[PDB]
UniProtKB/TrEMBL annotation:
Residues 5-192 form the Porphobilinogen deaminase N-terminal domain. The lineage of its organism: Bacteria, Bacillati, Bacillota, Bacilli, Bacillales. Tetrapolymerization of the monopyrrole PBG into the hydroxymethylbilane pre-uroporphyrinogen in several discrete steps. It catalyses: 4 porphobilinogen + H2O = hydroxymethylbilane + 4 NH4(+). It comes from the Bacteria. The modification S-(dipyrrolylmethanemethyl)cysteine is found at residue 222. InterPro entries: HemC (IPR000860), Porphobilin_deaminase_cofac_BS (IPR022419), Porphobilin_deaminase_N (IPR022417), Porphobilinogen_deaminase_C (IPR022418), Porphobilinogen_deaminase_C_sf (IPR036803). Its EC number is 2.5.1.61. Keywords: Porphyrin biosynthesis, Transferase. This is Porphobilinogen deaminase. It comes from Priestia megaterium (Bacillus megaterium). Gene3D superfamilies: Periplasmic binding protein-like II (3.40.190.10), Porphobilinogen deaminase, C-terminal domain (3.30.160.40).
Length: 290
């Protein structure tokens, strides 16, 4: 006579791996709950949750919409994985060692624009596929290197030595929420929220909250060359690095804010960058994306 928590999940191997990881972690609490996965886009999952067809969903935080519909909430952010972008080179060159005219594979304008801002003599080309697929294309096709999230490589079990070079935020500011998971549920589901609380990692949640406020006030998302990475410093301060880039890498807006309040920090970063023209650039890229 236990409540069975229905967890909706995307069909991919990464999404199901993340979903099962969360369920296994909640089971460590030894509380009287059962768990079941229902394979299920973001609108679809949120509708089913609002419809009570499912009780919760596990998303990569960088895939979460900046704005959740009324009634839903992020109920838990667990301990962050590696936040960094990772460079994997076919022949093992670091970024500064790649040959002139090297082609780096990524469909992310955030990633590509930042790389082009460092070296405009390389080329960024679209690529698709899960990690396994992109790694195969690196060996067999006309890419000299690809960019992947360190977090996805880790969660898929790839060795740390698969990575040629972990890119620090000073080279490539990560996508907002990269390496973090979001557990979404109904805001009034106090029983599930109580179960989720022990899995929540307050330091990760506070940093990501600052990133997400910046994202929301810039009206950012996946397709946008916008980036933000927050971290907790000794003493409780959050340091937020925020960035907006033109697709060609020749315009870079960058802002560093260190303070106590994640909402104030995120809001100030957006205010400063908006005043410099970064929001106009975001709007124009959105229009071109049609
Ligand atoms: C918004 C966006 N999504 C993806 C693809 C993606 N989403 C989640 C992951 C795994 C890591 C995580 O959960 O943090 C991935 C795969 C990955 O980042 O390697 C992207 C990247 C598209 C690409 O580079 O082609 C993005 C855009 C962005 O990172 O800004």
């Amino acid at each position: 006579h236990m409540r069975k928590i229905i967890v909706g999940s995307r069909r991919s191997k990464l999404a199901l791996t993340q979903t099962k990881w969360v369920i296994e972690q909640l089971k460590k609490q030894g509380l009287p709950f059962e768990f079941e996965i229902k394979e299920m886009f973001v609108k679809e999952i949120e509708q089913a949750m609002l419809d009570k067809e499912i009780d919760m969903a596990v998303h990569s935080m960088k895939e979460m919409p900046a704005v959740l519909p009324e009634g839903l909430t992020i109920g838990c952010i667990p301990l962050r994985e590696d936040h960094r972008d990772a460079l994997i080179s076919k022949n093992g060159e670091r970024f500064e060692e790649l040959p002139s005219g090297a082609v780096i594979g990524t469909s992310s304008l955030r990633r590509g624009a930042q790389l082009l801002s460092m070296r405009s003599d390389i080329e960024i080309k679209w690529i698709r596929g899960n990690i396994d697929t992109r790694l195969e294309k690196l060996k067999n096709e006309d890419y000299d290197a690809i960019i992947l999230a360190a977090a996805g490589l880790s969660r898929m079990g790839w060795s740390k030595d698969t990575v040629t070079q972990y890119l620090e935020p000073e080279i490539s500011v990560p996508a907002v929420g990269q390496g973090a998971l979001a557990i979404e549920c109904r805001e009034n589901d106090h029983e599930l929220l109580s179960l989720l609380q022990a899995l929540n990692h307050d330091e990760t949640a506070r940093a990501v909250r600052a990133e997400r406020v910046f994202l929301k006030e810039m009206e950012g998302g996946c397709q946008v060359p916008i980036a933000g990475y927050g971290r907790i410093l000794d003493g409780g301060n959050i340091e937020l690095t925020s960035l907006v880039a033109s697709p060609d890498g020749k315009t870079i807006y960058k802002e560093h804010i260190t303070g106590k309040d994640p909402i104030a920090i995120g809001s100030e970063a957006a205010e400063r960058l908006t005043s410099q023209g970064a929001k106009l650039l975001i709007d124009r890229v959105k229009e071109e994306l049609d």
